[PDB]
Design an enzyme around this catalytic site. Structure first.
Site, PDB file in Angstrom:
ATOM      1  N   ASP B  85       0.882  -1.169   0.000  1.00 42.66           N
ATOM      2  CA  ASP B  85       0.000   0.000   0.000  1.00 42.66           C
ATOM      3  C   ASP B  85       0.921   1.221   0.000  1.00 42.66           C
ATOM      4  O   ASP B  85       1.807   1.333   0.856  1.00 42.66           O
ATOM      5  CB  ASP B  85      -0.901   0.012   1.241  1.00 42.66           C
ATOM      6  CG  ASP B  85      -1.840   1.220   1.280  1.00 42.66           C
ATOM      7  OD1 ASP B  85      -2.827   1.248   0.509  1.00 42.66           O
ATOM      8  OD2 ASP B  85      -1.586   2.145   2.080  1.00 42.66           O
ATOM      9  N   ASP B 177       4.060  11.907 -22.215  1.00 38.11           N
ATOM     10  CA  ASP B 177       3.131  12.558 -23.131  1.00 38.11           C
ATOM     11  C   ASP B 177       3.117  11.653 -24.347  1.00 38.11           C
ATOM     12  O   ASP B 177       4.088  11.566 -25.089  1.00 38.11           O
ATOM     13  CB  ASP B 177       3.546  13.981 -23.528  1.00 38.11           C
ATOM     14  CG  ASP B 177       2.415  14.752 -24.250  1.00 38.11           C
ATOM     15  OD1 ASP B 177       1.620  14.130 -25.000  1.00 38.11           O
ATOM     16  OD2 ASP B 177       2.319  15.988 -24.061  1.00 38.11           O
ATOM     17  N   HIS B 178       2.010  10.941 -24.490  1.00 39.46           N
ATOM     18  CA  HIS B 178       1.781   9.999 -25.578  1.00 39.46           C
ATOM     19  C   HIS B 178       2.254  10.511 -26.955  1.00 39.46           C
ATOM     20  O   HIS B 178       3.131   9.911 -27.581  1.00 39.46           O
ATOM     21  CB  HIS B 178       0.283   9.676 -25.614  1.00 39.46           C
ATOM     22  CG  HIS B 178      -0.051   8.391 -26.301  1.00 39.46           C
ATOM     23  ND1 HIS B 178      -1.243   8.195 -26.962  1.00 39.46           N
ATOM     24  CD2 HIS B 178       0.644   7.236 -26.421  1.00 39.46           C
ATOM     25  CE1 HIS B 178      -1.269   6.973 -27.465  1.00 39.46           C
ATOM     26  NE2 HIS B 178      -0.134   6.370 -27.150  1.00 39.46           N
ATOM     27  N   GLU B 216     -10.795  13.344 -34.269  1.00 39.34           N
ATOM     28  CA  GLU B 216     -11.359  12.091 -33.799  1.00 39.34           C
ATOM     29  C   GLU B 216     -12.766  11.990 -34.355  1.00 39.34           C
ATOM     30  O   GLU B 216     -13.549  12.926 -34.224  1.00 39.34           O
ATOM     31  CB  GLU B 216     -11.416  12.051 -32.271  1.00 39.34           C
ATOM     32  CG  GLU B 216     -10.298  11.261 -31.600  1.00 39.34           C
ATOM     33  CD  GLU B 216     -10.280   9.779 -31.981  1.00 39.34           C
ATOM     34  OE1 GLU B 216     -11.282   9.254 -32.527  1.00 39.34           O
ATOM     35  OE2 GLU B 216      -9.243   9.131 -31.725  1.00 39.34           O
ATOM     36  N   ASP B 235      -8.276  17.645 -22.412  1.00 41.44           N
ATOM     37  CA  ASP B 235      -8.002  16.300 -22.901  1.00 41.44           C
ATOM     38  C   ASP B 235      -6.975  16.285 -24.034  1.00 41.44           C
ATOM     39  O   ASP B 235      -6.005  15.517 -24.002  1.00 41.44           O
ATOM     40  CB  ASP B 235      -9.307  15.640 -23.361  1.00 41.44           C
ATOM     41  CG  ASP B 235      -9.137  14.171 -23.725  1.00 41.44           C
ATOM     42  OD1 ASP B 235      -8.379  13.446 -23.038  1.00 41.44           O
ATOM     43  OD2 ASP B 235      -9.783  13.738 -24.702  1.00 41.44           O
ATOM     44  N   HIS B 240      -1.251  17.346 -25.392  1.00 40.99           N
ATOM     45  CA  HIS B 240      -0.807  16.977 -26.728  1.00 40.99           C
ATOM     46  C   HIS B 240      -0.504  18.136 -27.671  1.00 40.99           C
ATOM     47  O   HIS B 240       0.627  18.284 -28.132  1.00 40.99           O
ATOM     48  CB  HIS B 240      -1.828  16.041 -27.366  1.00 40.99           C
ATOM     49  CG  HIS B 240      -2.155  14.852 -26.522  1.00 40.99           C
ATOM     50  ND1 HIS B 240      -1.292  14.353 -25.571  1.00 40.99           N
ATOM     51  CD2 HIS B 240      -3.266  14.079 -26.466  1.00 40.99           C
ATOM     52  CE1 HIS B 240      -1.855  13.323 -24.962  1.00 40.99           C
ATOM     53  NE2 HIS B 240      -3.053  13.139 -25.485  1.00 40.99           N
ATOM     54  N   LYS B 343     -10.311  10.792 -38.589  1.00 46.21           N
ATOM     55  CA  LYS B 343      -9.325  10.578 -37.535  1.00 46.21           C
ATOM     56  C   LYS B 343      -7.991  10.946 -38.172  1.00 46.21           C
ATOM     57  O   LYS B 343      -7.560  10.296 -39.130  1.00 46.21           O
ATOM     58  CB  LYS B 343      -9.314   9.106 -37.103  1.00 46.21           C
ATOM     59  CG  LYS B 343      -8.747   8.853 -35.705  1.00 46.21           C
ATOM     60  CD  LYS B 343      -7.283   9.257 -35.573  1.00 46.21           C
ATOM     61  CE  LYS B 343      -6.885   9.380 -34.113  1.00 46.21           C
ATOM     62  NZ  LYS B 343      -5.550  10.015 -33.923  1.00 46.21           N
TER      63      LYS B 343
HETATM   64  N1  LIG Z   1      -7.407   8.872 -18.673  1.00 48.63           N
HETATM   65  C1  LIG Z   1      -6.365   9.344 -19.404  1.00 48.63           C
HETATM   66  O1  LIG Z   1      -6.255  10.420 -19.986  1.00 48.63           O
HETATM   67  C2  LIG Z   1      -5.204   8.428 -19.396  1.00 48.63           C
HETATM   68  C3  LIG Z   1      -4.959   7.940 -20.659  1.00 48.63           C
HETATM   69  C4  LIG Z   1      -3.971   7.009 -20.835  1.00 48.63           C
HETATM   70  C5  LIG Z   1      -3.261   6.588 -19.759  1.00 48.63           C
HETATM   71  N2  LIG Z   1      -3.533   7.023 -18.522  1.00 48.63           N
HETATM   72  C6  LIG Z   1      -2.967   6.307 -17.360  1.00 48.63           C
HETATM   73  O2  LIG Z   1      -3.228   4.940 -17.403  1.00 48.63           O
HETATM   74  C7  LIG Z   1      -2.959   4.397 -16.088  1.00 48.63           C
HETATM   75  C8  LIG Z   1      -4.073   3.453 -15.732  1.00 48.63           C
HETATM   76  O3  LIG Z   1      -3.562   2.532 -14.811  1.00 48.63           O
HETATM   77  P1  LIG Z   1      -3.705   0.973 -14.984  1.00 48.63           P
HETATM   78  O4  LIG Z   1      -4.271   0.812 -16.344  1.00 48.63           O
HETATM   79  O5  LIG Z   1      -2.332   0.402 -14.957  1.00 48.63           O
HETATM   80  O6  LIG Z   1      -4.637   0.336 -13.870  1.00 48.63           O
HETATM   81  P2  LIG Z   1      -5.665   0.366 -12.651  1.00 48.63           P
HETATM   82  O7  LIG Z   1      -6.424   1.643 -12.577  1.00 48.63           O
HETATM   83  O8  LIG Z   1      -6.597  -0.778 -12.742  1.00 48.63           O
HETATM   84  O9  LIG Z   1      -4.947   0.097 -11.229  1.00 48.63           O
HETATM   85  C9  LIG Z   1      -3.533  -0.119 -11.316  1.00 48.63           C
HETATM   86  C10 LIG Z   1      -2.904  -0.646 -10.041  1.00 48.63           C
HETATM   87  O10 LIG Z   1      -3.136   0.274  -8.953  1.00 48.63           O
HETATM   88  C11 LIG Z   1      -3.132  -0.502  -7.788  1.00 48.63           C
HETATM   89  N3  LIG Z   1      -3.614   0.211  -6.589  1.00 48.63           N
HETATM   90  C12 LIG Z   1      -4.817   0.839  -6.391  1.00 48.63           C
HETATM   91  N4  LIG Z   1      -4.908   1.484  -5.249  1.00 48.63           N
HETATM   92  C13 LIG Z   1      -3.697   1.267  -4.662  1.00 48.63           C
HETATM   93  C14 LIG Z   1      -3.247   1.702  -3.432  1.00 48.63           C
HETATM   94  N5  LIG Z   1      -4.138   2.350  -2.625  1.00 48.63           N
HETATM   95  N6  LIG Z   1      -1.972   1.346  -3.130  1.00 48.63           N
HETATM   96  C15 LIG Z   1      -1.265   0.588  -3.964  1.00 48.63           C
HETATM   97  N7  LIG Z   1      -1.624   0.095  -5.139  1.00 48.63           N
HETATM   98  C16 LIG Z   1      -2.868   0.492  -5.440  1.00 48.63           C
HETATM   99  C17 LIG Z   1      -3.997  -1.697  -8.169  1.00 48.63           C
HETATM  100  O11 LIG Z   1      -3.743  -2.803  -7.310  1.00 48.63           O
HETATM  101  C18 LIG Z   1      -3.483  -1.974  -9.591  1.00 48.63           C
HETATM  102  O12 LIG Z   1      -2.430  -2.928  -9.557  1.00 48.63           O
HETATM  103  C19 LIG Z   1      -3.026   5.568 -15.120  1.00 48.63           C
HETATM  104  O13 LIG Z   1      -1.755   5.816 -14.529  1.00 48.63           O
HETATM  105  C20 LIG Z   1      -3.480   6.731 -15.991  1.00 48.63           C
HETATM  106  O14 LIG Z   1      -2.856   7.940 -15.588  1.00 48.63           O
HETATM  107  C21 LIG Z   1      -4.435   7.996 -18.358  1.00 48.63           C
END
Ligand SMILES: NC(=O)c1ccc[n+]([C@@H]2O[C@H](COP(=O)([O-])OP(=O)(O)OC[C@H]3O[C@@H](n4cnc5c(N)ncnc54)[C@H](O)[C@@H]3O)[C@@H](O)[C@H]2O)c1
Ligand SMILES: NC(=O)c1ccc[n+]([C@@H]2O[C@H](COP(=O)([O-])OP(=O)(O)OC[C@H]3O[C@@H](n4cnc5c(N)ncnc54)[C@H](O)[C@@H]3O)[C@@H](O)[C@H]2O)c1
Lengths: 485, 485
Positions: B85, B177-178, B216, B235, B240, B343
């Site tokens: 944690d 940054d993708h 998009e 977004d 981007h 797109k």
């Molecule tokens: N929404 C967007 O614009 C966007 C787009 C692309 C990527 N992202 C990123 O994609 C990633 C998504 O993450 P994911 O797909 O790997 O999975 P996810 O959200 O399912 O969770 C990932 C991990 O977090 C762990 N976790 C949760 N709470 C925890 C805590 N309290 N302590 C310790 N571990 C904990 C879970 O056990 C899991 O292993 C993010 O970092 C996000 O920023 C964001």
């Protein structure tokens, strides 16, 4: 569209060029509605083919490209014929009657064009009689179209010019240069002055060397007779090449009219450096073709009508220098040859490499703007970009364009164009005396060394791109040919 | 090839991004021989999946792109797992044991990368504990990869930065940054500084306006929850778009290293003009999508999870101004939207028209250099040339290039690239704090006007290219969009 009121006289109206290109071109100008009614064509030669025989003759030249036969007949009815010897002063009075009659028949107020499709030697005479015997129009214009070639040296071209000057001013003269009428050659100015990025880059600061290539895969064939005395040096270099180099090296004109364009080209021609013996051996290369692999490709010295001790050059390559501020140190390379790897006419502008370092494996190279004239128009631009590797690295890519089918079908054949420009009175696409004089002066200095045999004669296997000496000529300045078969 | 000795810790190693892109990317670096032996991957999350369960999990992520299964197993054996944690300070001491153990097992001397694939709020905490609880490597490097997004305003991003600064220097931070990892975006510098003609033309004298487009065709779909609060403005624009605009507006660097590149981009960002209320209404446009024709394309306000009184912007368009000598008066146009015609991600550089007159019907127009990023890399260059007509006239033609199949297959996926650069320690392809701060400051001034509702909300039929206001925004400066579906 607007109607062109003119009366054209074809000296040698029964020849090859006449019935194979001249007449067809004139028919296209009729099909496109430019020539409608107030126009007439007066053929002339030695044969006394009567007025009915002439018409049939023309009907055969415009044969293959006509479908509404009624369109053909209505056109052919604007033609007339008259027998006439160009040396006989009185014979001209007969021609004057044929012309003064056709004018009356179609109410053509002056506007006469005299096309000379006769032997080079007759040029001076016809000019002289046209004026003295009174064939020249009192109203409108009087223009002369001089067929190839214009002189065989500076001395002879000067003679021709002086004879022509007796009756016409230089601007009324239209020397036919086949290549200057090609669509793609007329694009060079559009690309350069139409796009500021190139316009501003057209100088010693951005370009490393300009290359011009006139290629032919065919051998001399049955053209051996005349060719053995002219060679590539006079066949392709003096005329075609220099006039293309003119469009490339020209200064930026004060306007886009014939007067200003010519003034701009002459500035470069007047800066062209003329070579002495040593320089000819350092900057130029002359060669002759041997065997390829196939017996199909016979050595030059085994061609029909070729002397077994001929030193005629079938390939020429050289470095031109322009003593102008904008071209300080920029080599202009030209090459023309027979039995080369391919048939193609093109210009390759090589820009200087950038000095900006990326710390990469392959640092920036030279960009290249290639304008392809023959066989089909194309424009390629080689640029530096990023390679598809893990580590940052550059590579070169080619952006490309090609003429569309629609473009190719609408493209006006060179003769149609030249004839049309003359009726309009536009010397933009024609070489002027000043341009020709310098070209001759430049070529004469080279020929002097060749006729004296004070330069070696290289050899090359047919189908290649020329002798090794061609490469070494460019290697000397840290350069190389962009095209290579 | 050279071996990369590193130990990577994935916070959130069981998530989507983790098993869908992170793990595969790391496998490619193994396939290409970059990662061989002295490396280890320590997964981490809350679940107590035991060391055997983890391995199977990874075997499924790198499942579809493996053929020699023996290659897979040998790789998977470098992974270890530990439950933990991120808020529990003592839990870190457990992680430290997993890391200090893996290091010993593969003789990895330092070189640790901490990837944070957790919720934005945890970023500050993990950073804090990594240093205090001693997970940071005593030897080699310590780098942090921060996933999207970095703050939700200037205030919050400043907070994040200050927390991170406690343990890491800005250069040790790598914000993901993708778009900045896309192959084509990394070509912009090659084309510009690799070719002097563009290099010298990259300024107010030759360019009339630069355009950036992020398109998009898809709607919001099941992403409605989060999207309704962020919108296109945050977004696609803030992150981007600005970072791509950075590569475009940047000054010419004193060298091609991350340090100098960043210094060059910041010069432009520091000149970016921040808008007040009036300016926001004059220079920007926000819209929301209605119905197309097909019931398939439902209005935004009828999407699931969308409030029937939402003023969320699904499309943004605006004019950016850089108060720099090189950009004096050159408009930078950007646009991002949902449910648009196609797109595509591209940059369109419009050069100024030439002042040289040809006396022609159609005088010279504006040239255009288009760099297409998505869906597939392409580079088009519109230039002025000669039309195929009888009278001299200009037209525009497009020279084109496209990525080859070989190129496309060898193209390294964005994540693989970002991860690889970080192991190398190259911030060239990452946004720096200075860049992000200004981007936020710029966007905040716009959002202030939106949240206050002091600007109208436009509408547009789905499948179009946006509201009429987009066109009028460019028409004002005598401009227009190059791309239009
Ligand atoms: N929404 C967007 O614009 C966007 C787009 C692309 C990527 N992202 C990123 O994609 C990633 C998504 O993450 P994911 O797909 O790997 O999975 P996810 O959200 O399912 O969770 C990932 C991990 O977090 C762990 N976790 C949760 N709470 C925890 C805590 N309290 N302590 C310790 N571990 C904990 C879970 O056990 C899991 O292993 C993010 O970092 C996000 O920023 C964001
Ligand atoms: N060799 C090259 O490099 C080259 C290439 C292309 C074009 N050209 C040109 O092609 C043209 C060839 O001419 P052509 O194909 O029309 O035909 P051609 O040689 O057969 O003769 C043309 C006309 O000349 C007439 N003629 C001959 N002697 C005359 C005289 N003494 N008085 C009056 N009329 C006389 C003939 O009756 C005939 O009608 C030439 O003008 C030549 O310059 C040259």
């Amino acid at each position: 569209v607007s109607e062109i009121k003119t009366l054209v006289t074809f000296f040698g109206g029964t020849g090859d060029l006449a019935k194979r290109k001249l007449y067809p071109s004139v028919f296209n100008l009729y099909k496109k509605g430019y020539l409608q009614k107030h126009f007439a064509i007066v053929g002339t030669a030695r044969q006394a083919l009567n007025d009915d025989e002439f018409k049939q003759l023309v009907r055969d030249s415009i044969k293959d490209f006509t479908d509404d036969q009624a369109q053909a007949e209505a056109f052919i009815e604007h033609f007339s014929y008259r027998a006439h010897d160009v040396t006989d002063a009185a014979s001209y009075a007969v021609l004057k009657e044929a012309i003064e009659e056709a004018a009356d028949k179609f109410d053509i107020d002056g506007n006469r064009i005299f096309y000379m499709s006769v032997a080079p030697r007759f040029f001076g005479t016809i000019a002289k009689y046209l004026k003295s015997e009174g064939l020249l129009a009192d109203t409108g214009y009087n223009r002369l179209m001089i067929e190839k070639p214009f002189g065989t040296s500076y001395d002879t071209a000067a003679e021709l010019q002086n004879d022509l000057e007796n009756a016409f001013d230089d601007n009324q003269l239209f020397r036919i240069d086949h290549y200057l009428g090609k669509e793609m050659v007329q694009n060079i100015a559009a690309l350069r002055f139409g796009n500021p990025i190139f316009d501003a880059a057209w100088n010693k600061d951005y370009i490393k060397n300009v290359q011009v290539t006139l290629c032919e895969v065919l051998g001399v064939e049955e053209r051996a007779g005349y060719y053995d005395t002219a060679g590539a040096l006079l066949d392709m270099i003096q005329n075609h090449t220099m006039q293309i180099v003119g469009w490339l090296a020209m200064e930026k004109p004060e306007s886009f009219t014939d007067k200003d364009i010519r003034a701009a080209k002459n500035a470069a021609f007047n800066a062209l450096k003329i070579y002495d013996e040593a320089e000819v051996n350092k900057y130029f290369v002359r060669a002759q073709y041997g065997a390829g692999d196939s017996a199909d490709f016979k050595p030059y010295l085994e061609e029909l009508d070729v002397p077994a001790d001929s030193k005629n050059n079938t390939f020429i390559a050289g470095e031109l220098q322009f003593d102008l501020p904008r071209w300080e140190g920029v080599p202009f390379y030209v090459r023309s040859g027979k039995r080369l790897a391919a048939k193609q006419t093109r210009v390759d502008i090589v820009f200087k490499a950038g000095t900006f370092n990326f710390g990469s494996e392959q640092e920036a190279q030279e960009a290249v703007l290639s304008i392809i004239i023959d066989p089909k128009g194309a424009i390629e631009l080689k640029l530096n970009a990023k390679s598809v590797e893990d580590a940052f690295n550059t590579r070169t890519i080619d952006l490309g364009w090609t003429v569309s089918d629609e473009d190719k079908k609408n493209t006006p054949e060179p003769y149609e164009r030249m004839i049309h420009d003359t009726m309009n009175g536009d010397g933009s696409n024609f070489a002027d005396w000043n341009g020709v004089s310098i070209a001759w002066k430049f070529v004469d200095a080279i020929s002097a060394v060749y006729t004296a045999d004070k330069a070696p004669l290289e050899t090359y296997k047919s189908g290649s791109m020329g002798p090794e000496a061609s490469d070494k000529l460019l290697a000397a300045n840290g350069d190389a040919w962009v095209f290579k078969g």
